[PDB]
Structures are given as structure tokens and as C-alpha cells.
Design a protein around this ligand. Sequence first.
Ligand SMILES: Nc1nc2c(c(=O)[nH]1)N[C@H]1C(S)=C(S)[C@@H](COP(=O)(O)OP(=O)(O)OC[C@H]3O[C@@H](n4cnc5c(=O)[nH]c(N)nc54)[C@H](O)[C@@H]3O)O[C@H]1N2
Ligand SMILES: Nc1nc2c(c(=O)[nH]1)N[C@H]1C(S)=C(S)[C@@H](COP(=O)(O)OP(=O)(O)OC[C@H]3O[C@@H](n4cnc5c(=O)[nH]c(N)nc54)[C@H](O)[C@@H]3O)O[C@H]1N2
Ligand code: SF4
Ligand code: SF4
Ligand code: SF4
Ligand code: SF4
Ligand SMILES: [Cl-]
Ligand SMILES: [Cl-]
Ligand SMILES: [S]
Ligand SMILES: [W+6]
Lengths: 214, 972
Amino acid sequence: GKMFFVDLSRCTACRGCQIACKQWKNLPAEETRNTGSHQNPPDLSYVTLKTVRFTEKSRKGPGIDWLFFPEQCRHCVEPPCKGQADVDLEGAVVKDETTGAVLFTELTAKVDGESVRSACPYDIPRIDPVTKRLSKCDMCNDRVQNGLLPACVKTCPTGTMNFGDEQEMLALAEKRLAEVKKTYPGAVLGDPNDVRVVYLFTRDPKDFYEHAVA
Amino acid sequence: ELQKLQWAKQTTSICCYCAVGCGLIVHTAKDGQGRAVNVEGDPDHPINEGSLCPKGASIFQLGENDQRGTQPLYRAPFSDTWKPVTWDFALTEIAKRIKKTRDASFTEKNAAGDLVNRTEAIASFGSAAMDNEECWAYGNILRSLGLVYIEHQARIXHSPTVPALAESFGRGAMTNHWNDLANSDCILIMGSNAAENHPIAFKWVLRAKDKGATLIHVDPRFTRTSARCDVYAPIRSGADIPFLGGLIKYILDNKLYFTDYVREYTNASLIVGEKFSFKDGLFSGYDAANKKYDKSMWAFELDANGVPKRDPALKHPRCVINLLKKHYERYNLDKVAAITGTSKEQLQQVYKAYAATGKPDKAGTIMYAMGWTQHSVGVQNIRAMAMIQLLLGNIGVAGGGVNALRGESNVQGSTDQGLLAHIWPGYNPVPNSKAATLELYNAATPQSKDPMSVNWWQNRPKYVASYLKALYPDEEPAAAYDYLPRIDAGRKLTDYFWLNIFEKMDKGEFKGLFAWGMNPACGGANANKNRKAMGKLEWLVNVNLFENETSSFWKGPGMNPAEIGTEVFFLPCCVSIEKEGSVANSGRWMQWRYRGPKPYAETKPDGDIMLDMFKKVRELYAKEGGAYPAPIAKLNIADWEEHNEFSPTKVAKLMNGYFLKDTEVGGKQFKKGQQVPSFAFLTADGSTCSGNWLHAGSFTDAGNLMARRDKTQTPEQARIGLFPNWSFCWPVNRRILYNRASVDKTGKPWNPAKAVIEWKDGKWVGDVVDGGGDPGTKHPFIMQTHGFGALYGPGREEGPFPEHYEPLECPVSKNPFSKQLHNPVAFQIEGEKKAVADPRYPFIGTTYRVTEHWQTGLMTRRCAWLVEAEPQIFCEISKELAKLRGIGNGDTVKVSSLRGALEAVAIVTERIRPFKIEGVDVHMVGLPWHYGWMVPKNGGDTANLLTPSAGDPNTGIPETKAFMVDVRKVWS
Ligand SMILES: Nc1nc2c(c(=O)[nH]1)N[C@H]1C(S)=C(S)[C@@H](COP(=O)(O)OP(=O)(O)OC[C@H]3O[C@@H](n4cnc5c(=O)[nH]c(N)nc54)[C@H](O)[C@@H]3O)O[C@H]1N2
Ligand SMILES: Nc1nc2c(c(=O)[nH]1)N[C@H]1C(S)=C(S)[C@@H](COP(=O)(O)OP(=O)(O)OC[C@H]3O[C@@H](n4cnc5c(=O)[nH]c(N)nc54)[C@H](O)[C@@H]3O)O[C@H]1N2
Ligand code: SF4
Ligand code: SF4
Ligand code: SF4
Ligand code: SF4
Ligand SMILES: [Cl-]
Ligand SMILES: [Cl-]
Ligand SMILES: [S]
Ligand SMILES: [W+6]
């Protein structure tokens, strides 16, 4: 199946990926306000499948460590969300075994959405308060079936986003981790044997986001 | 097949936002017959390779936008409502207003008795957002109507770059191009936030770093750029010259300069006259009563042949390089640290890393933009970095140059087409009142008697004659010369520019304004003055995509529509993906783009709006007669249209030029109607037309070279990423300017692994050579009178070397460099109050951008995905200032200056720290200028309520990057 390798050592927080996800799906915008941060929307929601999270950490001397995290579903190799949805109604969460995508259907409206979110160790699923349907990143599975890159991977200007076959992408992830560790000694890959969205964090993943890793 | 893209036609386009020039793929429903359904990146484009930042990625939302104008609107005097009107009503009535105003204001002769043939009661602003063919046609319409007050974005953007780099190198443009950044060994980003404002540039920046480059960001703020650089150093707003002069001192003291490059290719050896001096912050020739320098005091000592004297031994005390060492000896690390706030340790670190590029086989580049230009010393900031690059041999080389990052998609092109008061297309000066004949106009061009000096501007008579033939093909150039308006020779040039246009408007001296693709109610410094001044117009024509703060200034904050007599016409134009034409990116790449969907609703491309309006003026003159109609009636507009609409293709071919008669030139035979193959084949005798000599070579008998999408490259070209067969760059496809400076006297590259040009088997291989001639036969800066990179540049209004002056509103009333506090010839308006070490306005104010919004936000405040990301005006402050003022993160604050005030959301961050200036912490307040009162709800208004209408004496750019403010918590 497929895999993303996300080299966060290259990310400029341009939010090209955040906008591209919405343009490809023609998703609506949220009502947002500035509460003292560039981050917005503040969280994933039913209409926001990817948001870039901004975290500032103090460093000695001028400047800071500014940590950017373009969050999305990790397309788990064995997704707990599906195990939980299947308790209430099969067919709410299905797999594409060719691409590796984990896919929510409109039958999510008939499962316990809060339980499905609770089952996700990455706190990814989001429920529509009106329909009770669940949404998240769907790996741009139809683009991928048609031999294209996911919208957020194609759009990325910096080579942060990478996509391809799992063997090539895990080899790339390990090669890049070894290089980036020359500058960022606490660099780590996120849950690389469990997920299909493999982040290279430049420091403790929890500094990027509370649910960055399981 | 993807359902979304079924039965949709694919076309290519170029991003309508920044001057990176990223490629797009547009899908249009019903095989081209419906609306856009998808816009994303062009995977084949050599600059972006399919990538798009959030602005390019949201073009679909801009184009398919229910808030867009649908048809013309009309606001009667004293009305509080728009009335929808027809195009025919709108343009018939606009023609009446233009003609009434022109017939009443037209001046044949000025008070001195000199011919000027000008209309002083109409001004025009705009626009770098229009296609190149539209910009060229627009400027020609305005000049045929007799206008001189013709300005656009460039004035308030990169205006100081042009004289700064032309003084230094001979041309004003960005010297290299985006792909070339990946060749650099050391990238200094300073006065630029490129990861936010040129995002796809960071593809190439990070590729440089992958290949071992050091990335350095010097900025008052820690930004999204800073996060990805190896070295981040703070600098106080307005303290660039201390930093840069300190690096000049460092390079000279440590002998880190490229000796042979400096001796041969710079003016280091030229001898400056005895009349040159500098004391206590003033150069020789200062006239205190008139606040002006006599620049004749700064002249070179000339030999008996009238060529500047040279001492190749670099020993004469009046050699440029010895006067340079003497000037910068004051810029020691302790004084530079004390005025910049930058630690001595970080100065040494940056200086060591950057000055290491003075090695012949190493290349350093500078990426700068508004952090340097938007100052009262903008020209001198840029001059200092140009001088550094010359000392280090970085000009003309791959991975080097001065990458002056242009802003709008076509601000390079709109400048090239002369939408500024002082220039015709192709940088031929607008005539002044003393140039009574075409002979007198041409006699002003400097000549050289140095046989190694190409002095290419000696070809100007060919370009002015070919331009006059493009406009008035039935007339001899000498006769057509009398049709075009002239500026008064007696006046400061800045009297004709943006800030003085608004001052005149506030005094009631303008009847009409075209706000053509600009939002001056938000984008102009001191926006309260602008908003009040527009109510003194009789009429305003606003051409734009949406209703906005300029169209609707009469119902803005504090305004009473019932007291405001201005008649307003709002004319809705097309978005970029709805028309065809070219845009010239920051590397001078002129890229052709195609229509996807038809124009939305009843919107029109600018070319049709301006052509239809002009034809209605011509028809009204035929009906009535009026003031000197010839320039209007005779203008060649037949060549601008096909099938009764504006023709991008025909206008582009006219800009390139064609032969009006069979001609022999350069011993080649040409036929009537053939395209001119390059500017080398233009003539002064009326045989050739060319709307813009820089375009001669863009659209030849071979076809539209701007439309080339060929990534074929020779091995030498691919090694450095020239892509010479991808689109076309002026001049004649020279991708890296000044590239003769990249080789020794035998034509061998300084840096063979990154050769730009190389003399191989009797020819220059690689880039197009910038100036023909065998190796060692010519000075490498062919557009300079004398041929050299100018370390000493005596044409600038405040002197031949940069010198630190504080911003006109500043936190200190001391200057450690000299007694002289402020730029002694600065552009300023008497009566306008300035906060100089005023405890009522104790904080540095500066304004800047975020990745997700564009310009005044007129476009992006309408795009819900971009508003979602950045919904409101914010105020960035340090933790230390937040503590001093009792401001919490997210609190509402009021920022105030002598000129206005506004509310914003506080962003309290360690990304900003105090600047320790002579031992005293100085706090800054940062604001984005992307917000305005019309939209969105709770978005906030323009930071330009706060900024000063004062700035650079060379170009009149306002000091929007360094002024003074207060901030206070709001309890609401
Ligand atoms: N996202 C985005 N991109 C854009 C635009 C946009 O609106 N949005 N506009 C386009 C246009 S028209 C232009 S001209 C370019 C401009 O691009 P930039 O020049 O990058 O734009 P700014 O953010 O205004 O200013 C750059 C930096 O100058 C710093 N600065 C402030 N004062 C000083 C000072 O005195 N010295 C120095 N050294 N730095 C200082 C600021 O903190 C800021 O980070 O961007 C273009 N691209
Ligand atoms: N405080 C402060 N002020 C600044 C700056 C700053 O850094 N700080 N930046 C300065 C700079 S560098 C610049 S360039 C100026 C920009 O100032 P303006 O040009 O006034 O800004 P906008 O109008 O927002 O942006 C350009 C306009 O182009 C219009 N447009 C887009 N496509 C078309 C088209 O096809 N035709 C027409 N007719 N219009 C079209 C858009 O709708 C938009 O209104 O602001 C300057 N002002
Ligand atoms: S597009 Fe790439 S660089 Fe920009 S925020 Fe997303 S992952 Fe980071
Ligand atoms: S893979 Fe597709 S659905 Fe997922 S974040 Fe990227 S653009 Fe959105
Ligand atoms: S990240 Fe969560 S929602 Fe996505 S596949 Fe894994 S368990 Fe399911
Ligand atoms: S705004 Fe500039 S960097 Fe972003 S997509 Fe457009 S041209 Fe490229
Ligand atoms: Cl899904
Ligand atoms: Cl109305
Ligand atoms: S610009
Ligand atoms: W600009």
C-alpha cells in the first residue's frame, strides 16, 4: 500500500496543504477568530480534515523553536476506529487494501461517533453535530486510485510532503531521519511500523501536538 | 477517470498573486463552455513543479466567488447607494467626464513658456495586477489623454531598487532568478520574509541548503522563514545601513574581497574629484536653505579625453576603494551592535559566513524586498548590499546576484510598461519641459569615450523613435514627440509621485482619479489623508474584482455619504484565469497564459474596458472638438483589436515591434510586416516600431517565445537551471544579468562547476552573454556609462555612499554615526507631525504580510479559506512589552500614531524581543496591512491608518516599515 513521509524539518507552515485539501473537496470554511495565534482553524472539525498546528518553544539566544504540525488521519495499518465502528454497524469504516486508505462512509451517522473518536489513539475523527456523520482525511483516495498525488502532497512547496509505495517511503523516512539528526539530535519518526502517515519530528513529538504519536 | 474533472477542458495559467510565477492547470466545465471546476499546480512548470502556496491553491475560490462584481455600478454625488448600470451608460458617461476635465485643464505651454501638452487635473493609479499588454495599452491611453500623474504599486514597492541597482550595475531588475537560488553557497534573507511572501522560492532555498548552503535570516521578527534558516539574527527596523556598512568594513579590513574582480570590474580604481567630502553626516555640496545636494561636487576627476581617471594600483587616496575604506571605518562592531540591537557575536557570525563567499568558487546571494525598500533610506539600504556583492565578486554569477524579490505577478511588467510618472515604456525617461525637441531629448543620454565601455543606452534614439512609431506610425518621430506630455524640468521629480498626488488631491487640485486595480484607501501610507482627499474629487473610476474600500470610500469609517460629492463608477474586471496574456515574473520571465472559463457574469478584461472607454473618448472628440485632440485622434489603436475586442496577441506583437517598411539593418534585409527579431535591429529613422524595446525578441517571426514550455537544456544550462527554452526573459533571454563578470579575461568561469557563460571553441556557451564581445574586450556592466560595478554612486539624492540616518519617526534623537539624525534631503510634507523620541509614541511600528493574505486583502478577505486561517488584524508584541502594558495574549489592543488608530488582537510572542539600543530596551509593535473595514465581519481596518506619508527622496516611497506608535489594552 501507500505511505506519506512528512519531513517536518522542511515545513514553512505556508498552509498550502490546508487550503489544497479544501479546494480539492470543495469543503466549506469555518467561522474563526484570532485568539492570539496564527493557528486557524484551531482544531480539526467535520469540515476541516487538516489544520496546521503552531507551537512555540523557548530556545537560548535569539529566536525560538517554532513547531509546525499539518495534522491528518494516519491511515493506520490496523485502524482501531474501524474495530470500534464495527461494534455498532459494519460498513461505516472500510479499508482500501490496494492503497492502504482507511475510509469513512455515510453509515458513520449510525455508529456512536464519540466512541469511534475515543478509539483513535491520534484523536482524529470529527463528528457533524447535525447529521452525526464522521469525517477525516480520506488520503485523496480517488486521486491515488487515478495515479495522482494527494492534493496536500502535490501542493507542498518545500518537500515536507512525500508520497509513494510503503517500502520506498519507509526507506526514505529512515534515510532522512539519520540526516536530520545531525542538526536535530532529538529527531524521531512517528509510529513508523503502525501508520501510513509517517512524520519526522525534530524533537519530542508531544511538543508538536498532544496526540502527535500514540 | 476522476468524476470531478469529467467533461472539463484543461488549460495552463500563471498564478495571479506573487512574482514567483508558479504555473497552474485550470479545468473548465463543459469542455471550456462552463465555469472553472478545479485550479491546481502545473506539474510540468520548472519553477513550482506543481507546488502552490495557499494563495495559488485558493485561486478557484477567488474566480468562482459569489461576492465578485457582476456589472457596472454607479454612485451619484451625495448618494448612499450604488445603482446597477450598463457598460454603455458607464463608459459613455466616463468619456464625458474625462473630456470635460481634460478640455478645462489641458495646458499647451507651462508658465515658463515651454511646450508640455499636459492634463494636470486627472491622476491614475494601477496596476501591476493587469497583463503586460493591458499595462502597455493603459499607459499609452493615459499619455494620449495628456496625463503625467500616472503611478502604480511600483512607487510604494520596489521604486528604490531601480535607481539603487541601476546606479550600481546599470539596470534596476532582479539580477538572477528563482531556480538559480539552489546554486548559492550562502543565502542571506534580509528585509524579506520569503517563506511567507514568496513561498515556492523556499523550494529552491532549501535545495541550496541540501547541497551545503548556509541560510541566514536577519529580521526584526522571528518568522516562518526564520524557523527554516541556519542562522536567525534580529535587527531593529530602520537599522539596516549600520549592519551593511559594518559588513563593508569587515570585508575591507579582513581583505575578504575578490581582488581581481574588484580591480577589473568595479569602479574601485576610479579617481573621485577633490570636491568630494563627507563630514558629520553631510556630503559636500549641501544647500541647507533648499534641502538639496549639488551632486556636481561628487564628480569623478576626468582625464584629458573626458574619461574618469583610473589608478590600477588602487593607491591614489581619491581612488573609490580608498574613499570607501575611509567612509566605513566608523562602522565598528560595538557601534553597529549598539544601534541595530544585534549582538557583536551574531554580527561576527553572519559577517564571517557571508564574506566567505568572496572566494571565486563560492557564491553568496541576497533575497530582500520591502524590509529594505520602504524607508527614507530605501535606495541607500540597497546600494550598501549592491556594494557588498561587488566587493565579493557575487554579481553575474550563479547562486549570487541581488535577488530584489518583486511583489505582484506583473509589477516587473507594469514598471517595464512605464506606469510611473518619470518613465515611458522601456525606461526611456518621460521628457521634461527643457527637452523641446527629440534632438534635445536624445542629447541628454550620457556618452563614453572609453573604447571598452559598451554604454548600451547610446542606442536610446532607436528605442524612442520605434516607440513613437508604435503610437503614431503616420508621423515622423520628431513630429510625434510633440504629442506626448512633458513634466516641468524645474520641479522635484517626487512632485509627480504617489504621496504628492495625494497631497495635491487633499488641496483639491485633482478633478478625476482612475483607481485601476489598486485599493489606495488601504494600500497608501497615511490612509486617513487618502480617504479624506478622495472626497475632494469630482469623479472616481474604480476598476476591480469586488466592491472595496476605495470604490466605497464615501461610506467608510466616519464618512457621511450625504456630504461627499464624488461621483463613482465601479467597473468589474475579469480574474486572471478568464483571460489571455503575459505576466513578467521577478526573474523577468514573460510567461503567456490562456483563458479557462469565460468572464464571470458581465465582467470584462481590463484591455476591453480601457479600449472601449478610449474609443468613446475619441468618438466624443469627433462630436464636439476640444483641447488639442491630435494625440487622442491619431493614436494607433487599430493594432490593439481583433474581432472588435482587445487582442493580447496583436498588442504583444506590437510591443516586440515590426518593420513598417522594407529595411536593411545589421546588414540583414527585412520586409514590411516582419517582426523585429531583437532590439539590436531597431532603427532611429522610423523604419521600425516597437512599443517596448525590452520586448524586441519576445514575439518574433518564429512565434510567441513567451508561450514556450520547453524544458530542454544543454548540459551547461541544466547544471545551473537556466531553462532558456521555458518562456522568454528580457533582455534577449539573458537569464543572469551581468554574466560577463562571471568569467576572467580569457572567458573562463570563476566557478566552473556553476558556470553561467564560458568561452568554448570561439563562442559564449551557457546563458545568452550580457553584451557581445570576445573575452577581455569590454567592461562587463554594459548599461553603465563607464562600464563598471559602482561602489561609489554619485547620482543618488543623499550621496555616493550609504550612511546611517534614523527613520523620520524614530525611538532615539541621537545617531552615533554623525551629528546628522535624519536623511538631510528626505521626502516630507510640511505640516505633517513626526514622533521623534516622543514618549506619547514610544514603540517602533512596522507593517508586513502573512502567507495567507494578499496586499490590502481586497482579494483574499473575499476568500473564505484564507479568512478562515487569518480572520482578523493582529498586533505582534514581545512578552516584555505585553508585561509593561498589561496585555495578555489574545487581548484587544489599540495601536495609535500621530495619524490614526485602530484595534487589533494581541499576539504576545517570544518571536519578538526588545532591541537594546545604546543600552536601552526599545519595544516594537508589528501589524499586518491586509485588513479593511468592508469585509470580513470583525476583520479590522488598514494598518495604513498609522503610517507616515514621508520617505525616500530618490523615489518618494513611504516609510511603512519604520515609524512610531503607542499600544494600549482595550477593556470592552
Ligand atoms: N503572502 C504574501 N505574499 C506576498 C504579498 C502579500 O501580500 N502576501 N505581497 C507581494 C508584494 S506586492 C511584495 S512587494 C512582496 C513583499 O515581500 P516582503 O518584503 O517579504 O514583505 P513584508 O512582510 O512586508 O516585509 C518583509 C519583512 O521585513 C521585516 N522588516 C520590517 N522592518 C524592517 C527593517 O527596517 N529592516 C529589515 N531588514 N526588515 C524589516 C518584517 O518583519 C518582514 O518580515 O510580497 C509579495 N508576496
Ligand atoms: N503599510 C504598508 N503599506 C503597503 C505595503 C506594506 O508593506 N506596508 N506594501 C506596499 C506594496 S509593496 C504594494 S505592491 C502596495 C499594494 O497596494 P494595492 O495595489 O492598492 O493593493 P490591492 O488593491 O490590495 O492589490 C492589487 C489589486 O489588484 C486587483 N486585481 C487583481 N486582478 C486584477 C485584474 O485583472 N485587473 C484589475 N484591474 N485589478 C485586478 C486586486 O483585486 C487588488 O485590489 O501596497 C503598498 N502598501
Ligand atoms: S504545504 Fe508543505 S510546507 Fe506548507 S504547511 Fe503544508 S506541509 Fe508545511
Ligand atoms: S491526503 Fe487528501 S484528504 Fe488527506 S489531508 Fe491531504 S488533501 Fe486532505
Ligand atoms: S488515525 Fe484514527 S481515524 Fe485515522 S485510521 Fe488511525 S484510528 Fe482511524
Ligand atoms: S502566490 Fe507566489 S508562491 Fe504562491 S502559488 Fe502564487 S506565484 Fe507561487
Ligand atoms: Cl475517510
Ligand atoms: Cl447599495
Ligand atoms: S508590487
Ligand atoms: W509590492
